[PDB]
Design a protein around this nucleic acid. Sequence first.
DNA 1: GGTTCTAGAACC
DNA 2: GGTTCTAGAACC
Lengths: 100, 100
Amino acid sequence: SNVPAFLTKLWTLVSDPDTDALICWSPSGNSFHVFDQGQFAKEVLPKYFKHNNMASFVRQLNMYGFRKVVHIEERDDTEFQHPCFLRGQEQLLENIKRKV
Amino acid sequence: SNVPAFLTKLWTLVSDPDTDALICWSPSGNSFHVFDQGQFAKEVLPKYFKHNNMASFVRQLNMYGFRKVVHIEERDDTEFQHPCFLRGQEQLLENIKRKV
DNA sequence: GGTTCTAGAACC
DNA sequence: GGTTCTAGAACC
C-alpha cells in the first residue's frame, strides 16, 4: 500500500497496549483518546515523529481531516475522530486524504 | 489605567519569584521564557486564566502581538517577546494593542 | 474579550 | 511532506 506514514504511525501509536495508558482507542473503536496531553507529547511523540509537541501532532490530525470530539464542561482528556480511522478497519486509512 | 487584563496578568505571571521556576523574565528583561510547557499549563495558567491549555495561552500572546523567539537546534523551553513588554517598563503595557 | 478549534504559509 | 508559527472564525 501507499498510505501516508503519518497514518500508519497514528494507527500504531493508538493500537499499542503499552501506549494505551496515554493514548488508546475508544471502547467502540470510532475514535481515539489522549490522556495527560503533555506527557504523551514528551514521552511518545518523539518515538514516532520528529518532534515532541502536541501542537504539531494535532496540526497533522487536522490536515488529514480528523476533528476533535468536544467534551462539554478536572478531565485532562483530548479525543479525535475520523470516519475512515476505525479499529477494525485498517484498510480504510488508504481512504484518508490530506488536503493540498 | 485601562490596560487589558491579559497583559496585567501576564506581567504578574512572569514577575513572580515563586513562579520563576516555570516562567520568568530573560536576564536582560527584553523577553520571557517558559519551561516544562505542560506543567506550567497545568499548574499556573488556571490560577490566572479560565483554562489550562498552553495552546490557548499562546493564542493570546500572538493576538497581542507577541512573537516566539526561535531556539535553533533536549531543551524544553519556549520564549516570547514584545517590544512594549519589558521588565523595567510596566507603563508600556498600556502601549500594547490587540488586533481587531 | 477570552477560549477553542482549525488552517495558511513559510521554512525545512 | 512534516514542522512550526501565527491567525481566522465560531462559540462562548
